[PDB]
Structure 1
Amino acid sequence: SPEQAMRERSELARKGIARAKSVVALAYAGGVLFVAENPSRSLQKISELYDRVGFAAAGKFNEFDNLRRGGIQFADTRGYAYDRRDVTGRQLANVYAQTLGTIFTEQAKPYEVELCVAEVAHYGETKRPELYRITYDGSIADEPHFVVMGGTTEPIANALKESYAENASLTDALRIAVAALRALGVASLEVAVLDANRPRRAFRRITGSALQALL
């Protein structure tokens, strides 16, 4: 009776992901903005995969750490195989979905993680940012505006669907993100941005005095 087994595994994964912090990613005029509740200064829930691809997750650290390492390995191998301009976020999202789907069925314990992949345009080009969502069972979905994962999501989604204005600024988008997450000072916050005005590498972290002034 695979019905009971799949129901139990889905319940286990849902209960594992439910008791976790929330991560919010949204797109502004300069790219994508990642904000997470990370009191620890040594463990990071937001990172980069390639020159234009970003990584974000919520759940158990030892799982999405391995997922991030595998994604970085795949991106580097693919970039060296053909070219640096032939790497797209869709290829990484598909690999993540396949890996999670394989883990869910065969492995005794499923992964209690939620993944999001974001990409931006290259230098001197105009393109809308792309956001993808990958769940524990391997489902992949496309989100045009924002992705909310971790803990409860309905109130946060309803708060974000109200004050979200397209083509906003960094300070304004940060204010909306903090207000939505609150419903938090320099501490207990991790902020990263994918800047589309950079020559090659678009990922950079904002902490300390710059984060204090912006917030």
Structure 2
Amino acid sequence: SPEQAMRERSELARKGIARAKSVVALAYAGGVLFVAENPSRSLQKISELYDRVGFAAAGKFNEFDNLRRGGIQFADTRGYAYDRRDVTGRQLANVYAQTLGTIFTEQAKPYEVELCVAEVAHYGETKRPELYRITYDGSIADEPHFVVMGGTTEPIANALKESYAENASLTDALRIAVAALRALGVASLEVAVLDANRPRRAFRRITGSALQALL
């Protein structure tokens, strides 16, 4: 009975992601801001895939670590093949959806991960940030403003649906994200941004005294 196996796999994946922590990604006036609940510093849930692409995930560390490594290899090979400007987050989101679907179908245990791909505009060009969400079964979707994943995401989803205004500054966006995640100091918090103001590489890590000064 394929129906029973699919139902049990979906329930297992949902229970696996439900115990994980919440990571919040949103777009502000200068790109995409990533905020995550991460106590250790050796383990990073937010990374950079290409010059203007970003990565975020929640769940078992090894699974999305492997997915991140595969995405980096795919992006670098595609950039070396045609050009650096021919790589977009849509291709990464599509290949991630296909890989997650293949894992869900033809593997003993489905992957308990939830990925988000955020792309920003190239330097000197105006365009709105694009966010994509991929689930455990390989579903793909487009989210205009914010993406919330991991655990009991209903309160954070409500808190980001309400009292959210676009074109906000980095400080206000960070404060709103922290407030929605609570519903929290320098430690146990991971903050990364996609700064479109940067010429080639838009990924930046905010840690240390700068993070404390921000909030």
* TM-score calculated relative to the size of structure 2: 1.00
Alignment partners' CA distance in 1, 2:167 and 2:94: 28
What CA deviation, in whole Å up to 9, does each residue of 1:145-176 have, x standing for no partner?
A: 00000001111110111121010000000000
1:50-129 mapped onto 2 (5 Å cutoff): 50-129=50-129
Alignment partners' CA distance in 2, 1:197 and 1:110: 39
What CA deviation, in whole Å up to 9, does each residue of 1:94-113 have, x standing for no partner?
A: 00000000000110000000
What CA deviation, in whole Å up to 9, does each residue of 1:9-55 have, x standing for no partner?
A: 00000000000100000000000000000000100000000000000
SS at match of 2:121: coil
1:117, distance to aligned residue in structure 2 (A): 0.1
SS at match of 2:104: helix
What CA deviation, in whole Å up to 9, does each residue of 1:104-156 have, x standing for no partner?
A: 01100000000000000001000000000000000000000000000011111
Alignment partners' CA distance in 1, 2:195 and 2:38: 22
What CA deviation, in whole Å up to 9, does each residue of 1:41-83 have, x standing for no partner?
A: 1000000000000000000000000000000000000000000
Deviation beyond 3 Å, 4+ runs, structure 1: none
Alignment partners' CA distance in 1, 2:166 and 2:178: 17
* TM-score calculated relative to the size of structure 1: 1.00
1:9-88 mapped onto 2 (5 Å cutoff): 9-88=9-88
SS at match of 1:201: coil
Q: Which runs of 5+ in 1 are unaligned?
A: none
Alignment partners' CA distance in 2, 1:90 and 1:104: 21
1:190, distance to aligned residue in structure 2 (A): 0.1
State the partner residue of 1:151: 151
Q: How many residues align?
A: 215
Alignment partners' CA distance in 2, 1:58 and 1:163: 25
Alignment partners' CA distance in 2, 1:131 and 1:172: 20
SS at match of 2:162: helix
Q: Percent identity of the aligned residues? A: 100
SS at match of 1:158: helix
Q: Which runs of 5+ in 2 are unaligned?
A: none
State the partner residue of 1:136: 136
Alignment partners' CA distance in 1, 2:116 and 2:24: 10
SS at match of 1:32: strand
SS at match of 1:163: coil
Alignment partners' CA distance in 2, 1:186 and 1:163: 24
SS at match of 1:133: strand
